[PDB]
Curated annotation (Swiss-Prot), chains A, D:
Functional summary from the UniProt entry: Self-assembles to form an icosahedral capsid with a T=16 symmetry, about 200 nm in diameter, and consisting of 150 hexons and 12 pentons (total of 162 capsomers). Hexons form the edges and faces of the capsid and are each composed of six MCP molecules. In contrast, one penton is found at each of the 12 vertices. Eleven of the pentons are MCP pentamers, while the last vertex is occupied by the portal complex.
Protein location: Virion; Host nucleus
Organism: Human herpesvirus 2 (strain HG52)
Complexes and interactors: Homomultimer. Makes the hexons and eleven out of twelve pentons. Interacts with triplex proteins 1/TRX1 and 2/TRX2; adjacent capsomers are linked together in groups of three by triplexes, heterotrimeric complexes composed of one molecule of TRX1 and two molecules of TRX2. Interacts with scaffold protein; this interaction allows efficient MCP transport to the host nucleus. Interacts with capsid vertex component 2/CVC2. Interacts with the small capsomere-interacting protein/SCP.
Lineage top rank: taxon: Viruses
The protein, known as: Major capsid protein
Family: Belongs to the herpesviridae major capsid protein family.
Length: 49, 49, 49, 49
């Protein structure tokens, strides 16, 4: 309510994209033919749960 | 000394890849069985998280 | 103090992967000899462990 | 009984996935054309036998 902001999470359009974006974004398949992916950018990134 | 951090989250759903990012990053990858349509070529409606 | 424990287990047979997940990670892999039918696109009837 | 649960073990539809299932869930092929793997999830994870 202060920044009037929000954050994404780890989400994508395919399970194929969800698999290779696992262990982090060192090799994140961020985009593909029509598909896409969002790596989590958040105060909650880097944590477990 | 315990409490709540409330964070709203944003997920774009069913949007579409822009005109530049429609590549594959390698030739042979995300390939179907040879009698199958490769469903990654149409606009996505699914979402995974 | 040397004790006991039981666990129950779930194993799937014969199921079929959903259509978004029928992909392969790479194109050239799990290929037979060049005159052979590629039986990997068949309904799975086994389970190994 | 108290949780009404069961556990999945390291199993896969083909041995061709089960060879990749060694050395953990780092790089195991979770699926293929129609062929599919289930990695372990158990109290037995991390252990040898």
């Amino acid at each position: 309510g202060l920044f009037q902001e929000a954050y994404p999470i780890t989400c994508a359009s395919d399970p194929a994209l969800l698999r290779s974006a696992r262990d982090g974004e060192a090799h994140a398949r961020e985009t593909h033919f029509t598909q896409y992916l969002i790596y989590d950018a958040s105060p909650l990134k880097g944590l477990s749960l | 000394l315990v409490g709540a951090m409330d964070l709203t989250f944003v997920l774009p759903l069913g949007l579409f890849n822009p005109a530049m990012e429609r590549f594959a990053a390698h030739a042979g990858d995300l390939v179907p069985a040879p009698g199958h349509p490769e469903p990654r070529a149409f606009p996505p409606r699914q979402l995974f998280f």
